[PDB]
Paper text:
Analysis of the gene cluster and the CDPS indicates that ll-cWW 4a is a potential substrate for the C3-indole methyltransferase SgMT, leading to the formation of the pyrroloindole product 5.
The major domain of the enzyme features a Rossmann-type α/β fold accommodating the cofactor at the bottom of a large solvent-filled cavity, which is further delimited by an all-β cap domain inserted between strand β5 and helix αE of the Rossmann domain, as well as an N-terminal extension completing the walls of the cavity. Overall, the structure of SgMT closely resembles that of the related C-methyltransferase PsmD from Streptomyces griseofuscus. While two out of three chains in the SgMT asymmetric unit form a non-crystallographic dimer, the third one engages in an analogous interaction with a symmetry-equivalent copy.
Author numbering:
A (entry chain B): 8 to 270
B (entry chain A): 7 to 271
Write the structure that this text describes.
């Protein structure tokens, strides 16, 4: 049940390709957006938890800017990469959201960059909003991105190819996007062909793996309700870590919100 | 002379059927219907038919089913062996690369080329092929073929960037990359194919990868009309994919028919 287990060793190269070819934000741009957002807030930010930290690309960006960072992810394979990047001092928590085994009065901000929250059902993200609210003091903030309208329009029909593929550094990926009838999720299947350890007779060989990435579309009305229900205010959406508004073409919606003084 | 169908021949028939079932390619009996109706409209009867670029013989088998006496020509030994299995020993199969057609004058009543073999010919090679076909046909015989239409290039080729598509079919996986090299008279469709290996690697099934370039030469309508006029044909007409519909900007496969004149070629 870890779709990133087979992806972890090539994830960083694929993330760079997605920046180069699928308009994903480089983590330094995410860092610029976060610092501009936090600088506009009254309460200073020193400690940051990134949930769904993956291989730690965003952790490293924030640490380079002087933040004291902690990461959380469910994937041991991804966290092994994050440990190699960050070294031994960085706290890395292996847990599956909505579980956040960490105490209140500790984090000034929580972030989730590059779409980990797309993997959570509505009830799982609701409980995650609650867990984040318990960790943040009044005036702390929560920032994350999820797929926008333009993503579902572009990769989940119409007129679009249902199968996509990429050949990158001797690995090959074949992606299939399916929308089950009457389901609250959409499915992206990763077929991956990777060079094998040895050869078959006199030919190079490849191992095939198949992994399902199940995504839950998150309407704006749902985000706003979840924010209100869990002690957040001033929820705003922007297009992909820019100052532009969310709109019909947005591929990645960036949400920011502020913890109230509620309990 | 590379043979891009060498690695494809084993799985070609399954892929061709997928393209009919899913990509609007004409079922071979629709091609047969179209040919029989077109030939029936001509004064000169048709019994003997040469299919150039016959591949694995899917169109040979359809024309034989309808009662024609068919001969096939293809450059790919791998494809032709499949045609030999399909047709048996009675059918003449010629291994030759167009424009070479080593067959006698006064032999064929019609020449056909179904499912896109002529897309692989440069304008010079297709001009020479028109000449060779003209020499094989008596006055009143006909030549029918299909090439990619305007809608095919618009759908699969982007002038600005490569396009990538894929298919997983019966444990074979294809990755297709479509490019338009600058200033070239061709466009490129690369086939990466993953097929099951002969043995396993440790405890995991293994796959072999092949890569083969399919190089296609767009053939504008004005060029077909010119080639027909230059090589002894008349009444050149285009239809959409072996139907009675006209060729149009959305057509994926342009079906051309033309009639041999009395000129000496
Ligand atoms: N319910 C869940 N709990 C914890 N981690 C989850 C999760 N669902 C998805 N993930 C993690 O979400 C990550 C998405 S990849 C994003 C990695 C990183 N934030 C970056 O900027 O590159 C994966 O590592 C995946 O394991
Ligand atoms: N210059 C050339 N000379 C001969 N055959 C050629 C050729 N260029 C391409 N071909 C052949 O064109 C074929 C295209 S596939 C079409 C197969 C068949 N007509 C059918 O209806 O399914 C391949 O078998 C390929 O080897
Ligand atoms: Cl961008």
């Amino acid at each position: 049940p870890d779709p990133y287990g087979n992806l972890a060793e090539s994830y960083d190269r694929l993330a760079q390709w997605a920046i180069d070819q699928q308009q994903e934000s480089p983590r330094d741009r995410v860092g610029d957006f976060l610092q501009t957002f936090w600088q506009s807030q009254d309460r200073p930010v020193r400690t940051v938890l990134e949930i769904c930290c993956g291989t730690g690309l965003m952790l490293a960006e924030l640490a380079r800017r002087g933040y004291v960072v902690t990461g959380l992810d469910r994937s041991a394979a991804m966290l092994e990469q994050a440990r190699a990047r960050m070294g031994g001092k960085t706290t890395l928590i292996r847990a599956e959201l909505p579980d956040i085994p960490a105490p209140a009065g500790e984090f000034d901000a929580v972030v989730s960059a590059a779409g980990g929250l797309n993997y959570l059902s509505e009830s799982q993200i609701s409980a995650t909003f609650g867990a984040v609210a318990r960790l943040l003091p009044a005036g702390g903030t929560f920032t994350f991105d999820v797929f926008g309208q333009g993503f579902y329009a572009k990769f989940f029909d119409p007129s679009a190819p249902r199968v996509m593929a990429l050949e990158l550094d001797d690995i090959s990926y074949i992606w299939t996007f399916t929308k089950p009838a009457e389901a609250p999720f959409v499915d992206m299947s990763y077929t991956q062909f990777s060079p094998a350890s040895r050869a078959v007779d006199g030919e190079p060989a490849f191992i095939r793996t198949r992994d399902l990435h199940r995504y839950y579309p998150l309407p704006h009305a749902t985000v706003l309700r979840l924010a209100a229900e869990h002690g957040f205010t001033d929820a705003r959406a922007h297009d992909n870590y820019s100052s532009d508004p969310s709109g019909p073409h947005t591929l990645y919606d960036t949400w920011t919100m502020v913890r109230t003084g509620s309990l």
